[PDB]
Design a protein around this ligand. Structure first.
Ligand SMILES: C[C@@H]1CCO[C@H]2Cn3cc(C(=O)NCc4ccc(F)cc4F)c(=O)c(O)c3C(=O)N12
Ligand SMILES: C[C@@H]1CCO[C@H]2Cn3cc(C(=O)NCc4ccc(F)cc4F)c(=O)c(O)c3C(=O)N12
Ligand SMILES: [Mg+2]
Ligand SMILES: [Mg+2]
Ligand SMILES: [Mg+2]
Ligand SMILES: [Mg+2]
Ligand SMILES: [Zn+2]
Ligand SMILES: [Zn+2]
Lengths: 237, 66, 47, 261, 261, 237, 66, 47
DNA sequence: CGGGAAAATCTCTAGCA
DNA sequence: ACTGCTAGAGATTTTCCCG
DNA sequence: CGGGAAAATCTCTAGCA
DNA sequence: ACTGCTAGAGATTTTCCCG
């Protein structure tokens, strides 16, 4: 509340995002998002051949987390089943494909329509090469290639560790999806509160930002002002 | 430094149960987390809960909403 | 010591008495004629 | 009550009267009649009326097999969040269960699985799969589905959703995946008003963040506390109370009669 | 919310999302999402969570058939007291049930019987037996044992007692009669700490005595009460309240705004 | 409490029983029973022959309530089963029999031992004659004699009405058993309280009668006295 | 005369239930008995109970014991 | 009026909507395609 | 008026199949 | 227009008993 | 500070087979 | 030495909102 001027000064000086201001100056995320305002669903699909069997590989671009399994045939039904599974396990919004025969079939389009996925036609190649390397490493521990493929997926997702902080792909995708959930929560709160107009002390209508227990935060003429609940009225428009 | 980390730790909410009570209790505030026990603060009362009886979340709804 | 009467597995007839070895929350470990059994506390009575 | 006790034991050998009847009919105190009943092996036919509580740690998954339209559906649930994972399998075979569990371990941080004593779950192939992925197998008490009530209720919910959305699909496996999708992302409720997927993401991210934060706090905050004893480790202090860990026994003591060094 | 409602109905046709999910994902008020769910026939799959209560009048008896050791046991219970009457019968035949019910009517004041829709209980012979003895047949909702939960629990108790005392008898019928004796006279509890026989004697004697006493009181006490209306009949007066019966509708009104003539 | 002298005077004048004093002067039954102190289990068993079949008839002597059924043969097993049923339905304490072959068999003796019945070897003949009359009346309404016998039992127990107050046999037996239950309740209460001794104001030991909420009723030297709870002590001997 | 009969009527105790409550309530005092309804007095509160929901006894234990 | 969805007799599939005729404590009488059914209120939902 | 012990009350579950 | 219940095993609360 | 309405909470049941 | 739960339908209690 009292830190709104400090947050505005910090934004003017360092151009910090609303996350930093909300974490530092103890502000609600809507106020910080207004001050600063004043990929998670991306997947790539590819088919890879190994020892005469087809491996369908899905990678989460923003994290490198992979989803692969051996399919009996390179058929639109099998890849539609794979994509429906992927949508059922992760929040898949759009998939990138290579204009193959199995990706432009009507079954896959119907699966995307039902699962709410948009179809759009370099990371995938490196991911396939790394998956092949791990499969070659762990082939001797599995009789079938399908078991070895799942071993390689497990190893790449939770055992191999690299990056800035040295996290695995599973931790990265979990963090990314958590951040996306936070972003969606904030967007829903903004949409819910944006339909209100506030009159304070009576002055002109002011966009509502926060409806705290002891105060009401509003915006007037590109300036954020805090008024008490007992000196302002909020109406829905 | 340390106070920021403690504040972040206390920003998490814990849902927990007792040994003979089958209903999950409200979102108490997390104070300490261990391998097999968590320390909570539920309505000005500090309790120690086994890790298998606690669900520690954050609630992004609440976070991004005050 | 304790006496335990129990309903082991798909057998509606109650059996006992058995020696109580371990009492946890929800289940008990018992000994009945040199046989170790784990019975839920719903299906057991301890005296 | 020596005469009354003998006439009550003699009647109990014939009728097995409850403690109230013998207390009334022989002027016995309630404790004496209860002792008479408690010493009769033939009257011990009811267990205590409570329920246990399943493990709810973030690493526990409960697996079970259900049957629909003549097929076998292998279902796994994350206990802490309600996030489910189901797949139609050709048969209840240790190979299929081992493959499903390897997939599950490769997708999410599965630390331990709680299943019943079915043949597929007790196979050596599943044991080898768990050993390679570092999964600890917990087997329920035989013929006690209440030990896996979470996955049993999830079987019920999955079957209900499959019945809801069966017409939209032509095979059972497509409808099963559709029901998994609907349960994981189209049904809200629970602790945070979440879906299953949102709740599981929150649970795992919270585990990671809390682990890292507590590690940093314990690295920085290093003190010994004397109360009433030995040099107990300091866990949390404030609000007139101190939380300490002495000999791997965590106890909460007030700020009085305690000094931090 | 016109745009949001359409995008939620379109999603519900695919996923059948619960009201919480559509309220969260489309910014709908809870009432709007609940209306969306309530208008979908495919989501009406759960009844309200309560239970009814069986008739407990002194004249109601609940009858049922149970099976033990390959034989058929016909059991009747007096609902108000828990007094039971059981007998091994050759088969679930309307003749045997009619004979058993005629015996029951000749032994106790049986006014009405509540049974399920088994073949023996729905036979014309049983109907003729009930008509001759003036017994009113009440048939439960089909495949709803909760309508006769009293006799079902009595079947459970009788089987437990038979298991307790089976060794003392050589045939099943002797053990059944022994269990009936034990339940009726050797087990105390309930409302008055009674046995079943004591409780049923108390119930019937109380019914007779209260009927006679109330008949005498109504013969002597004859008054009309005006309150707020018509000449309501006086039932009970005192302690600042008056109980009256106007047009076969019994209501309790305070002594104020009421005059007795 | 205050009516103890009135109850003593009433007993001296009219020799009324404790029931009347307890119902009139508002006294606990123990006090009235002390002032006045200062069949329900009887059954008869007989075998009757009609149309070549044996009817086993049990009558409650104190009420005239009958229990009859047609048995396949005049055998100790059948009559033992009948008597075990009768004990299971009514509080049977002793049965009167006519020293027949089926009544002195070992099976019937064992049944009496298990059911707690004592065996002892004119009302029964008149009851049998009345049962035969009713059976002859209602035979035309039943194909079998066993159904007609049960019809006759029902009619005699609940339809035929006679006596002083014009009650049926079922009402009479219900009232008699209720009175016996009251008598047993009073006897148990007397036995429970008779093991106590009371010292009042301290005077000699006094037999305890009642332990009311606001007073204690005791007996000393064949005289009933009411003392407060706060001036007396009760001990168990 | 009438007062004695009323006192005898009020000497009986009734066990009863409500429409949505499955546990039997305590022994209220009987004031009036009808064909389908009984009038009771439970802890200084007068209620009308359907006859099918009431168990009217006397309790000879209590009677012969104060 | 009211819409009733119910689970009649040994059939796990829910049926409806039906016309509500009588609502008692514990059971309801309904009409579904000129067929009168009595269903316990546990196995019915009224809207 | 104050603890302890005993009694009463409340809670909760399996089986009825 | 019809309808879960019952009895026992623990846990918790009330009441009685001597101070 | 006071009602109404809406939201949150509590209670309770079937199915898991 | 291990362990009923879950989601929805009504009913009841809290809280918010304008006076
Ligand atoms: C062929 C007749 C007529 C038509 O229906 C069948 C089937 N049935 C089933 C049960 C039963 O399910 N008992 C377990 C139970 C479960 C729940 C509950 F609340 C009460 C309970 F007793 C009976 O008791 C019973 O008598 C019958 C029966 O007689 N019949
Ligand atoms: C041969 C495997 C291993 C050995 O035992 C059998 C039998 N069984 C029985 C049920 C069951 O009774 N479900 C209904 C239910 C009843 C009560 C409750 F609390 C939870 C409930 F789910 C299962 O679910 C189940 O998976 C099995 C199973 O798998 N097996
Ligand atoms: Mg299983
Ligand atoms: Mg199962
Ligand atoms: Mg039946
Ligand atoms: Mg039945
Ligand atoms: Zn016994
Ligand atoms: Zn729907």
């Amino acid at each position: 509340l009292d830190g709104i001027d400090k947050a505005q000064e910090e934004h003017e000086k360092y151009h910090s995002n609303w996350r930093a201001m909300a974490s530092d100056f103890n502000l609600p995320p809507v106020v910080a998002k207004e001050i600063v305002a004043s990929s998670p669903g991306i997947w790539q699909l590819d088919c890879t051949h190994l020892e005469g069997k087809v491996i369908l590989v899905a990678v989460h671009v923003a994290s490198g987390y992979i989803e692969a399994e051996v399919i009996p045939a390179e058929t639109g039904q099998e890849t539609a089943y794979f994509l429906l599974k992927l949508a059922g396990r992760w929040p898949v919004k759009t998939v990138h494909t290579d204009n193959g025969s199995n990706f432009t079939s009507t079954t896959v389009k119907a699966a995307c329509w039902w699962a709410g996925i948009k179809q759009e036609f370099g990371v995938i190649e490196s991911m396939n090469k790394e998956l092949k390397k791990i499969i070659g490493q762990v082939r001797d521990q599995a009789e079938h290639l399908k078991t070895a493929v799942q071993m390689a997926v497990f190893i790449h997702n939770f055992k191999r560790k690299g990056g800035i902080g040295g996290y695995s792909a599973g931790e990265r995708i979990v963090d990314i999806i958590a951040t996306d959930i936070q972003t969606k929560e904030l967007q829903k709160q903004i949409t819910k509160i944006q339909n209100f107009r506030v009159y304070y002390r009576w002055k002109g209508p002011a966009k509502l930002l926060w409806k705290g227990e002891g105060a009401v935060v509003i915006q007037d003429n590109s300036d954020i002002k805090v008024v008490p609940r007992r000196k302002a009225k909020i109406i829905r428009d | 430094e340390l106070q920021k980390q403690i504040t972040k730790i206390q920003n998490f909410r814990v849902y927990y149960r007792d040994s003979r009570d089958p209903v999950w209790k409200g979102p108490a505030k997390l104070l300490w987390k261990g391998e097999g026990a968590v320390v909570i603060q539920d309505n000005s009362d500090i309790k120690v809960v086994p890790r298998r009886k606690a669900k520690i979340i954050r609630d992004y709804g609440k976070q991004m909403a005050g | 010591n304790f006496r335990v009467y129990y309903r082991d597995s798909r057998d509606p007839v109650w059996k006992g008495p058995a020696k109580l070895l371990w009492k946890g929350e929800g289940a008990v470990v018992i000994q009945d004629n040199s046989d170790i059994k784990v019975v839920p506390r719903r299906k057991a009575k301890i005296i």
